Design a protein around this nucleic acid. Structure first.
Ligand SMILES: [K+]
Ligand SMILES: [K+]
Ligand SMILES: [K+]
Length: 179
DNA sequence: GTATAATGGG
C-alpha cells in the first residue's frame, strides 16, 4: 500500500531512544500528568480535556503528524476556548502549564520513537482478519495505553511493557473481528 | 493490574 509504504518510510527516520533519553522522557510525562491534575483542580475542567488541548498546542513541533489509530485533535473552537482559560491563569499556576507542555511534548516524542516497534509486532499478526493498516492502528492504540501506564522506576525497558500492551491490543482486535 | 527485551528476524 502506498500510504503505508510512506508511513513506514517516515517512522524509520525516527531514531531509537537510549535508556537515558527514555527515563528522561518518561519522567517528564509523569511530571506533566501531575501538573495537569493541578490545572484541573484549579480550573474545574477535565484532566483529559486539558491534556488534549495542551497536546494540540505541541503538535506543531511534532515529527510524525497523522499517526494511524491515534485520537484526533478536538475541534479548534474547543482548543481556543480551553487554551484561553489556561493562558489566563495566575502566576503560580503558569509553571504547571509549562510542565504540562513539556510532559505532552515528551509523550509525543516517546510515542514516535516506538512506532517502529508496533510495526514489527504487527507483522506477526497478518492474515488473521485485519489488514496491515488495521493492525498498525490497533497496535498504535496499545502503544498509547502503554505510555499512560508505564512506570520507569521499575527499571524495565519501555519495549518490554510496550510489547505486552501492543499484543493485547492486537489480540483483542482480532477476537472482536471474529464475533 | 497487566513489566527480561524486543524497534529487519531468529
Ligand atoms: K544480519
Ligand atoms: K543481512
Ligand atoms: K545478527
Amino acid at each position: 500500500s502506498d500510504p503505508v509504504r510512506q508511513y513506514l518510510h517516515e517512522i524509520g527516520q525516527v531514531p531509537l531512544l537510549t535508556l537515558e533519553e527514555e527515563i528522561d522522557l518518561a519522567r517528564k510525562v509523569e511530571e506533566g500528568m501531575e501538573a495537569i491534575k493541578k490545572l484541573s483542580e484549579a480550573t474545574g475542567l477535565d484532566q483529559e480535556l486539558i491534556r488534549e488541548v495542551v497536546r494540540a498546542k505541541i503538535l506543531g513541533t511534532a515529527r510524525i503528524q497523522k499517526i494511524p489509530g491515534l485520537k484526533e485533535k478536538p475541534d479548534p473552537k474547543t482548543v481556543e476556548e480551553v487554551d484561553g482559560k489556561l493562558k489566563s491563569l495566575p502566576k503560580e499556576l503558569k509553571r504547571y502549564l509549562h510542565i504540562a507542555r513539556e510532559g505532552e511534548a515528551a509523550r509525543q516524542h516517546l510515542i514516535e520513537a516506538n512506532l517502529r516497534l508496533v510495526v514489527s509486532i504487527a507483522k506477526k499478526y497478518t492474515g488473521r482478519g485485519l489488514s496491515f493498516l488495521d493492525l498498525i492502528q490497533e497496535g498504535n492504540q496499545g502503544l498509547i495505553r502503554a505510555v499512560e501506564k508505564f512506570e520507569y522506576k521499575r527499571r524495565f525497558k519501555f519495549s518490554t511493557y510496550a510489547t505486552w500492551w501492543i499484543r493485547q491490543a492486537i489480540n483483542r482486535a482480532i477476537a472482536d473481528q471474529a464475533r
